Write a protein that binds this ligand. Structure first.
Ligand SMILES: O=C1COc2c(cccc2[C@@H](O)CNCCN(C(=O)CCNCCc2ccc(Cl)c(Cl)c2)C2CCCCC2)N1
Ligand SMILES: C[S@@+](CC[C@H](N)C(=O)[O-])C[C@H]1O[C@@H](n2cnc3c(N)ncnc32)[C@H](O)[C@@H]1O
Ligand SMILES: [Zn+2]
Ligand SMILES: [Zn+2]
Ligand SMILES: [Zn+2]
Length: 428
């Protein structure tokens, strides 16, 4: 049996619904593939990727009216039109004032797909969009205010062609988009867009995941990173595994209303190395260390919101200033130091400072390999960033070693026949 035939929908105790294997799955094996029910490309990736198939290309056929949407050919342009029509005219009319969030952009595509294709889609083999968990009973004022702001934005930019249901039905739908929604990312883990994969959304969370979700354009591919036996539950990671048990569970309680009780969460085995303190002769107080963790956590959240409006020169300054204050107590291997080093590397890449970005990457990779589990995409993308930075700076010996190390992880996660692997092999 293959695809969703060798797997089944079942009730996981204390987790609601879940997916379990009916056949053995080895490391690297493709469990199932799921096409996108609805998908949307991020504004910052326009001109680099096709709006319909997400294929990265140089020189795409741009839209005549708006000149914002880019396509492979007339076929990609015509096929994306039922979804693009909701944005083409408003982009010309509103101009700089056209600013709907990616959540609003995607929810509009779901409402359009629910109209065009009301019957069951190939994306809904085991779980349907109408059957999705919303956590309406658990929703607080903070979330309801954000959902209401999104509903108001949906009415402001998409009410020309889309007939909306009652406010309470939209509250449930937006909550379902947050609970079951995915973000399509490339080989370098750069944000490409947002999508809905109902069959993939059936899998529960674990900090020790047995599977990984990679993308082949708009198609999500689920591959094993651990040995799965028949009857075993299929688990994926909903969050970045670099952070300790506290930081991990605070995000899971805030975004998905649950507390993870897996092996890494129970034992808290990696927490010590993650929040590593320097070996000082005159160390700060236990309360002073707690203050720096609080500062670092607030600096990460402030950078998250500042990223979308502040200039790269300002963003690089917060990365540098935070690192200097944290470096007085925290080690270079510390996860809070690594985040600001990663963000500074990202800023350096936008500013096209290759030597600057390489300096950070060389300090990030060794603690990254230690903190992250085996076959992690964050480690794979870091080797991929280093390799491409070494190759570009004519250090072809160091590049070849890093790109091969990225391939070694990606052959299990993306599969040996993935187009990304073929590109990296051609770069060598
Ligand atoms: O089925 C899944 C999906 O989750 C997975 C699964 C597997 C692997 C990885 C991930 C995740 O990493 C994917 N994350 C995607 C990003 N995403 C969010 O984080 C939304 C949460 N909002 C944060 C707080 C918040 C919670 C609830 C409410 Cl109601 C409100 Cl208002 C706010 C959005 C998606 C839709 C477009 C906007 C972004 N398995
Ligand atoms: C995207 S849905 C996963 C499918 C869901 N279990 C269903 O009913 O179809 C995520 C929700 O599943 C639950 N969940 C996932 N992993 C869990 C875990 N390890 N422990 C407890 N609940 C979990 C939470 O309620 C979370 O909001
Ligand atoms: Zn295309
Ligand atoms: Zn257009
Ligand atoms: Zn856990």
């Amino acid at each position: 049996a293959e695809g969703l035939g060798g797997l089944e929908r079942f009730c996981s105790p204390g987790k609601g619904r879940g997916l379990r294997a009916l056949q053995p799955f080895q490391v690297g094996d493709l469990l199932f593939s799921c096409p996108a029910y609805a998908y949307v490309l991020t504004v910052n990736e326009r001109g680099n990727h096709c709006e319909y198939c997400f294929t990265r290309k140089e020189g795409l056929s741009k839209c005549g009216r708006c000149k914002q949407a880019f396509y492979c050919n007339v076929e990609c342009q015509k096929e994306d039109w039922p979804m693009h029509k909701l944005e083409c005219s408003p982009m010309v009319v509103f101009g700089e004032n056209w600013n709907p969030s990616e959540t609003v952009r995607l929810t509009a595509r779901i409402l359009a797909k629910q109209k065009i294709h009301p019957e069951r889609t190939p994306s809904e083999k085991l779980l349907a969009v109408k059957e999705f968990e919303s956590h309406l009973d658990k929703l607080d004022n903070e979330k309801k205010d954000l959902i209401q702001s999104d509903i108001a934005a949906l009415h402001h930019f998409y009410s020309k062609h889309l007939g909306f249901p009652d406010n309470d039905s939209l509250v449930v739908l937006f909550a379902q988009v947050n609970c079951n929604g995915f973000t399509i990312e490339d080989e370098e883990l750069s944000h490409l867009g947002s999508a809905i994969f109902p069959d993939v959304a059936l899998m529960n969370h674990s900090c020790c995941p047995n599977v990984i979700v990679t993308y082949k354009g708009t198609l999500a591919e689920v591959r094993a990173v651990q040995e799965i036996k028949p009857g075993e539950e299929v688990f994926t990671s909903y969050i970045d595994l670099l952070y300790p048990t506290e930081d991990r569970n605070d995000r899971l309680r805030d975004s998905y209303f649950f507390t993870c009780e897996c092996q890494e969460c129970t034992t808290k085995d990696k927490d010590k190395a993650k929040v590593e303190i320097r070996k000082l002769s005159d160390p700060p107080k236990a309360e002073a260390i707690r203050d720096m963790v609080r500062y670092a956590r607030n600096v990460i959240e402030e950078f998250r919101r500042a990223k979308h409006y502040k200039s790269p020169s300002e963003l690089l300054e917060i990365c540098e200033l935070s690192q200097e204050k944290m470096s007085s107590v925290f080690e270079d291997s510390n996860v809070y130091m690594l985040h600001m080093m990663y963000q500074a590397m990202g800023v350096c890449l936008y500013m096209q400072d290759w030597e600057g970005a390489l300096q950070y990457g060389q300090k990030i990779i060794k603690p990254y390999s230690k903190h992250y589990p085996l076959y992690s995409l964050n480690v794979a993308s870091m080797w991929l960033k280093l390799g491409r930075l070494y190759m570009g700076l004519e250090h072809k010996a160091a590049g070849e070693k890093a790109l091969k190390k990225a391939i070694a992880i990606m052959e299990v996660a993306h599969g040996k026949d993935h187009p990304y692997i073929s590109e990296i092999k051609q770069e060598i």
